[PDB]
Each structure stands twice: as structure tokens, then as C-alpha cells.
Symmetry: D3
Subunit: 150 residues, 6 copies
């Protein structure tokens, strides 16, 4: 319940613009615990696996090349309904459609430069996390903060 985890990723455009700390802080303020964190250069295979559900899309190729174009900071956050909440905090697909207050809403304008990526469902999160992180890279005994959880 409270141990639900979602996978986030500061895209290459997000890293190049120096938005890593801003994004992280927003999740920390919200009360979600960071249980996995690292910066790396996505490999083509990682890019296509993460977005495999889009393989047949015409822009899939452009996406893969972009994701693997520069460093990316991968994160895993745990907390009550973190998956859908993280999505709300991100915005929607189109940055211009994303509301002020949301990451893409405040920083993005192009769907191709969406700043941050994140799991859209618990099912997808468990798959993405297992894809990007090895078991020994994630915290284990995470104790609920009495100020955040009842």
C-alpha cells in the first residue's frame, strides 16, 4: 500500500538544462522517498525496452536516439499512490497542455523535449524499475515518516 514504487527519469533535455535538482526536490517535498538513484547514458536496448509499447509508432525511432543521446538521471520513489501522483506532478503528454505547477507545465513546450518520463501504472512501474535498477541498488527497510503517514 504505502510501499508502492514508481520509476522516474530526467530525460536528456532535462539533464542538459540543469533541472535535475528541481525535479528531485519536488518529489522530496511531496513526501515520496527516493529508493533508487543514478545517472547514466541509456543504451539503445534500454531505450527500446523502456518504450517497447511504442515500437510501432512513427516517432519511436526519434525517441530512442534522443533518450540515448545524453546522460539521464533515473529515480525510484516510494509512497502511497506514488505512481498516479507522480504523473499528476509531471503533467500530461503535451507540455503546452500541462498545467502550471506541473513539471512539463512550468518547463516544457515540445512533446519531444518532455523533460521527465515516468511510469503510467503499477504494472509498468514494476517493469521499468526492474529494467533500470538491479535489486541491490534499491533501499530495503524503508520506515514510514510519522509526519507523512498516519
Amino acid at each position: 500500500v504505502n510501499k508502492e514504487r514508481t520509476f522516474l527519469a530526467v530525460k536528456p533535455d532535462g539533464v542538459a538544462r540543469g533541472l535535475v535538482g528541481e525535479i528531485i526536490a519536488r518529489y522530496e517535498k511531496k513526501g515520496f522517498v527516493l529508493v533508487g538513484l543514478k545517472q547514466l547514458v541509456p543504451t539503445k536496448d534500454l531505450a527500446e525496452s523502456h518504450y517497447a509499447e511504442h515500437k510501432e509508432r512513427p516517432w519511436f525511432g526519434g525517441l530512442v536516439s534522443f533518450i540515448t543521446s545524453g546522460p539521464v538521471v533515473a529515480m525510484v520513489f516510494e509512497g502511497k499512490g506514488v505512481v498516479a501522483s507522480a504523473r499528476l506532478m509531471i503533467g500530461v503528454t503535451n507540455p503546452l497542455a500541462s498545467a502550471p505547477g506541473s513539471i512539463r507545465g512550468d518547463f516544457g513546450v515540445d512533446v519531444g523535449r518532455s523533460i521527465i518520463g515516468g511510469s503510467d501504472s503499477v504494472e509498468s512501474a514494476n517493469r521499468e524499475i526492474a529494467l533500470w535498477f538491479k535489486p541491490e541498488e534499491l533501499l530495503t527497510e524503508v520506515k514510514p515518516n510519522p509526519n507523512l503517514y498516519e
Copy 2:
């Protein structure tokens, strides 16, 4: 009209997390005047009166004990439609449902740790203010800021 007042309260979880100034500033930026302010430890009777409309609810008891568990900063803000506006700035009951930009939206995740409480109607506000503050604790001749009011 412009002298409408609402009662806000930084819950114990909000005080313990050091969010007092953040919340206050947000109301100050909005243009609402702070006419009453103090920090105290709610007494059981104050807790049950404030939330009397919930007395029969199964979680009422847990709420009272929490509200009286630690210090709380009580505030009174005045301004055009401050009651409903203050609510919008807070979010909705469920922190996870609260939109980014809103207090609970940016800081909360659990209904039991909602960070801040506030009047839901002018009727409730007049009752809550009179409950938490004595007449001599509130400013009187508040002059409208020409930059904020037409």
C-alpha cells in the same frame, strides 16, 4: 465584501515539517492580509469543537488526538473571497488528488497528514475564528492595499 475572513491552521504535521513559513508566504503573496496569528497546543475540547461536524465519524477520534498531539499555528486571513480561495490554494481533502501548485498537492500524500486545515464556508469561518481567537487578538482597521484592491 473585501473584509471577509477565513481561519487557517497549520496542522501538527505541518509544523513538525517546518512548513509554517512556506504556507504563510503563499497567502501573503496572494494578497490576503494576516489579521490573527499564534502557535499553541490545541486542547481536546478545541479539537472536537473545530471538527464537531465530524463527531460521529469513525476517524474523528484519531483526528482529535492528532490535532492535539503537537503545536499548531493558527491564522486568520482577510480579503475578497478569501474563504473559497484559501480552499483552492489548499487543494482538496485527499492530498494525492490535490493538484500541483496547491499546498497539499505539493506537500501531502495522506489524508491524516493534510498539513493545513481551513474553513469551508463563511459560516464555518466566523465560527472557527471566534473559536480560536479572542476579539482583541485580531486587527481592526485594516486598510485595503491600493495595489491589491480597486
Copy 3:
């Protein structure tokens, strides 16, 4: 497409409250390029032209006098769908109705002290820009930021 431009104006109430930099920064963070900028005291004629579509309204007169009451910082931003996006970032007509995260939502309370004004359509933007800025006051060869545009 990506060269679309909108006209913004920090109203006199916005300038007097020291919100110029806050507003500008929000547009800069969003990724919109500032192609025209200056502070001036609107002339009655400029005020009535900008808001000519409201000439017959009962509050038109009050508006003109206010707009020309003090300095105003006029801005022109360019970017994908900047017109409608800029509006979203501003909020709606009524500041109290404007959502948190939006300029009026976070700073305003009175329709007469709306902090910032902005074009509601490409048609209106092209007219407002040409009204407030001379051609040699606007940048020309603006190169798309590879971090912002695909």
C-alpha cells in the same frame, strides 16, 4: 509554427508590487524566448487601443486610467503555441478563480488588479505587438534551443 509570438504586459499593480522578475522568470523557465522588452508609462491612446474591444464596457474607463497610472513592463515572447500557453500560465479573468500555480492564481484577488495582461489569440497578439513595439525593437534571427525544440 515555433516562431509564434505573444504580447505580455506587467500591469501597473504588478510593477508596483515588484513582481516583474517573477513573471519574466516564469516565462523563461517555460522555454519561451523574450524577443521584445521595455518599461514605459502607457499613454491614454495606447491604453484604449490595446483594449479597444472593450470600449463600450462600463469599466473600460476605469481600466484605461489605471493602465496609464504608472509604469508598465511590456514583453514579447516567442515559442510553440506561446499565445494560449501564456494565457494558461496567467490564469483566467478572475484572479480568485485562477488556479494555484498560475500568475493571477498565486498573486491576485481583484479583476481590476490582474497583475499581468496578455494576448488571447494570434490575431490579437500580432495587433498588440505591432501596437506596443516597433519592428527594430524585436529580435530577428532567433535560433531554436536544441534542448527545447525537437
Copy 4:
């Protein structure tokens, strides 16, 4: 002893400029705990007693009249060496001389509009606190934070 205390007061200007929350949050970030808070309109006897040290100043009557001109938010913070630290966070007597990062450094320009006042010694703090606050308005249970204190 992490139980040291000091008296901080954001002068009438501080409040008028809506800097209360900004101030309070700075001390919260530091890890200092608010043990007393309230808004009030200083009395002559109070202000004359607060600054009695400068009874022999050509600007004494001026200061008193200002301090009692509008509402003031009085605060008491507790923590390791909070007295001298609070002073450092405030700046120096002259706002223009105060360094960026410090309250007066970032917000003030006139010695008469110094934004915030604060005890200059434990001796002065114990006197100022006892002057502005009744024992019953002060937090009794002084709890230490493990993340802040070893």
C-alpha cells in the same frame, strides 16, 4: 545546550511588505524550532521597554513611534547558538552593508526599515522573550531532532 532561545520580531515594515512567511521559513530551514509566535500591535510601554537600551538616542522617539505604528509578528526560536546565528542570518545594522543571503541584505536599504529585529545576546533574549511572551504562550516540551542534533 541546544535549548538556547532568542527573540525575533519582524518590524511593521516587514509585515507590510508581506515578508513574514519568507522570514519564518529561513529559520525553519536552519533547523531552529519556533517555540512562540503571535501577531500584535506593540504598546508604547512595550516598545520603550524593548529598546530602552537606546533611551538616549535622537532617534529613540522615532523608533518607538514606528514600532507601535502597525502590527508586528513576535517569534521565539530555540536551538544551538540560535542567538548569534539568528543575528548572522539577519545581517548587520545597515541593510546596505548587510550581505546577500542575509534578510536585510536581500530585502532592506534603510536602517529605519530594517525588516526584522533580534536579540543580540542570551541575556537580552531572556529579557525580550519574558517581555513579549507570557510563559503560557511558550512551548514547554523542547524536543530535539536527530537529523539536526547528534
Copy 5:
């Protein structure tokens, strides 16, 4: 005299890094009043006249070429001792030597990318302002703020 003025300019890098609003707001918070603003692409005659003091520098031609390489936002701020204060808020010549809290301290690392430029004396300010701004672009009515000035 709270009517002192100084010339501030955020160099081409400052603008490219989208730091204009961040800068302007810092000076606004201080209580300094913007009496002149505009964006432009410096001319050789302008930049050579601005930094004529260093005509005898092996890096003079380099500085000129940079200053005229992209848009620049020129500003004029008025207030008590704004000249030296603005300097303090900027930092020192070397960004790495500039202290945290100061503009170059928080944003710069290279002397060639110093983010912002500013008059070093009232004499230099009066010359720089008259160089960059026409009398008609400067705010005439110099109004003092009671919360800022006694």
C-alpha cells in the same frame, strides 16, 4: 538621497541562460526601483564606449565582440546607495571568488561569462545610463516607498 541610480546589464550569457527574471527580482526584493528597462543587441560603438576604461586590455576586443554577440537587457535602478549595493549583490570580478548569495557566486564560474555587469561608481553610472538610455526612456516621477524609506 534615495534618488541615486546605477546601470545594470545582464550580459549575453545571462540572457541565454534565462537568468533575466531571476536577476531583476533580486533587485526588486531589495527595494530598488526599476526606472529604465529594455532589450537590445549592443553596437560596437556602444560596447566600446561602455568599457572604454579597458581599451588597453589584451582581452578588450574579446569582451566587445562578446557583448555585441547577442541580446542584452539593460536596466536602471534607483535607491539609497544602489550603486555600491548593486555591486555587492553582483559579487566580485571572479565568479568563483564571488560568495554564495551573490549573482555571480550562485550562477557563474568564468570571468568571461560574468552574467551581469554594473556601474562601479555614481560617476560611472551617470555616464553609463546616459550612454544606454535616452531621457525619455527613464522614469521621471521618482516616488519613495514608506515601508522602504522613513
Copy 6:
């Protein structure tokens, strides 16, 4: 050489207080580039090797036990004189002595809860980086930013 590097680590307290993003963003604003990042729970061999310099300290065993008490986010930043600059941005050993604007100055109060640790020399940085990070976790392509470097 703008290729200098230093090792920064936000201690267990830093993470518990959710200051990771706040920290990372400060260095990002400066223009320093993250070339390595990850979260982990330090080992005794690691912490004893990190602070081996103070093996002869009555508080050595205490520090080690703390450093290995909870997760830590290890970072590597590259840039002109990043080592000494990072130190300046951190503050001094004593948080209460650290100036406002600096990390410990704004967030710390106890030497034992210093929030963040950082190399004190290029020699120490090269050793600390090689200690905490494997060559494969470090960004190879070191690209300079024109707005930051001339």
C-alpha cells in the same frame, strides 16, 4: 582546465531532511556538471577509507557509524575550480559559523549534522571519486557550455 572534478556527498541527515534536490540544483545553477551520481548505504570500509584522515579522532568511530547509518547520495561535479568553489558553497566546518547563502549556513546547526561533505583538494577529490565511483559510472564525454565558458 575546466575539467577539474570534486566529490560531493550529502550525508544521511541531508537525505533524511529531503535536501538532496535542493543541493544538486545549487551546483547546477553555478554551471557545474554532474558527471556521476547514485544513492547507496556506505560500508564501514568505505566510510573508514573516506575519512581515514581523521583515524586519530575521538569522534572518528562516531562519524563512521553515522555515515553508514543511512542512505547517502554521492555526486561528482566537474568545472573550473569546482573543488574550492564547492567548498565555498558548502560553508565551513561549523554550520553555525557558515554564512547565509551557503548550504550549512542555511540548513545546519550541528557539526555532526553537517548535511553535505566535500573534497577539500584536487588530490583528495581524485582519491574520493575513485573510492566512491567506478570508472564506468563516470561521464566520459566532458562537454563545455559556451554560455558558461569562453
